[PDB]
C-alpha cells in the first residue's frame, strides 16, 4: 500500500461514480438503501394478491345478468332455501339471544 495507490483508487471511484471519500462498513448501508428498491415497493410485494373483490363482485354481477352460471352459489342457495323451509333460518339481527 502506498499514497500513489490511494490517489489512484480515489480517482477510480470519483470516475466510475462510486463512493469518493472513505466510509465505515456501517455507513455504506445508506448507499445500499438508495441503490435498491425498498422491499415494500416491489411489485412482488404490494401486488402479491389478485384483487379478490373485483373477481367476486364482477362474477357475481355477471351471474345476475345471466351470463355467468355459478353452480357453487346455486348449491349454496338451494340448500339455504330448503333450510328456511324446514324452519331453521338466519335470525334477523338483534332478535336471537334474548327472545
Amino acid at each position: 500500500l502506498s499514497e500513489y495507490a490511494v490517489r489512484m483508487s480515489r480517482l477510480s471511484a470519483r470516475l466510475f461514480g462510486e463512493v469518493a471519500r472513505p466510509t465505515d462498513s456501517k455507513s455504506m448501508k445508506v448507499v445500499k438503501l438508495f441503490s435498491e428498491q425498498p422491499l415494500a415497493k416491489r411489485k412482488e410485494t404490494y401486488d402479491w394478491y389478485p384483487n379478490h373483490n373485483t373477481y367476486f363482485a364482477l362474477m357475481g354481477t355477471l351471474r345476475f345478468l345471466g351470463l355467468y352460471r355459478d353452480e357453487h352459489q346455486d348449491f349454496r342457495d338451494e340448500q339455504l332455501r330448503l333450510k328456511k323451509l324446514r324452519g331453521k333460518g338466519k335470525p334477523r339481527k338483534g332478535e336471537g339471544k334474548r327472545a
Binding site: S27, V31, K32
Partner: protein, 120 residues
C-alpha cells in the same frame, strides 16, 4: 369539426371489412396498439421523460445548497451516490428525495447547532 369526423367515419365504414385473414387481424391489431411491435424491444412504450444519463448519474447540482465541509456533505454524498446507482427511480423522484432531506435538515437547525458542529 364534428362533420369532418363523421365524414372520416363514413369513409372508414365503407373502408372497413370484417377481416379476410389472420395477417389482416394482426395488421389492424398492430396499428391499433393491441398487438406488440416486432422485433421486440422491451423499452417500447417507456422513454423515461426524455432524460439523459447525466441527469441520472451526476446529482451535484442539487447539493449546491448544503454545508460544504461538514458531516452533512458526507451523509448527503452517500445518499447522492446511492441515487446515482438507482435504475428504478425517475429523475423527478431522486430530486424529491434530495429535497426532503434539504427540508428536514433545514427543519431542525436547533439540534444541529447544539450537536457540537455549527451546521448550515
Amino acid at each position: 369539426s364534428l362533420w369532418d369526423i363523421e365524414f372520416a367515419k363514413q369513409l372508414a365504414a365503407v373502408t372497413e371489412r370484417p377481416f379476410q385473414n389472420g395477417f389482416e387481424e394482426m395488421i389492424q391489431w398492430t396499428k391499433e396498439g393491441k398487438l406488440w411491435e416486432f422485433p421486440i424491444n422491451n423499452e417500447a412504450g417507456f422513454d423515461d421523460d426524455g432524460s439523459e444519463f447525466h441527469e441520472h448519474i451526476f446529482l451535484d447540482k442539487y447539493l449546491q445548497d448544503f454545508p460544504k465541509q461538514g458531516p452533512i456533505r458526507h451523509f448527503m454524498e452517500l445518499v447522492t451516490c446511492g441515487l446515482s446507482k438507482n435504475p428504478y427511480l425517475s429523475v423527478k423522484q431522486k430530486v424529491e428525495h434530495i429535497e426532503w432531506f434539504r427540508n428536514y435538515f433545514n427543519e431542525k437547525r436547533v439540534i444541529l447547532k447544539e450537536s457540537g458542529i455549527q451546521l448550515n
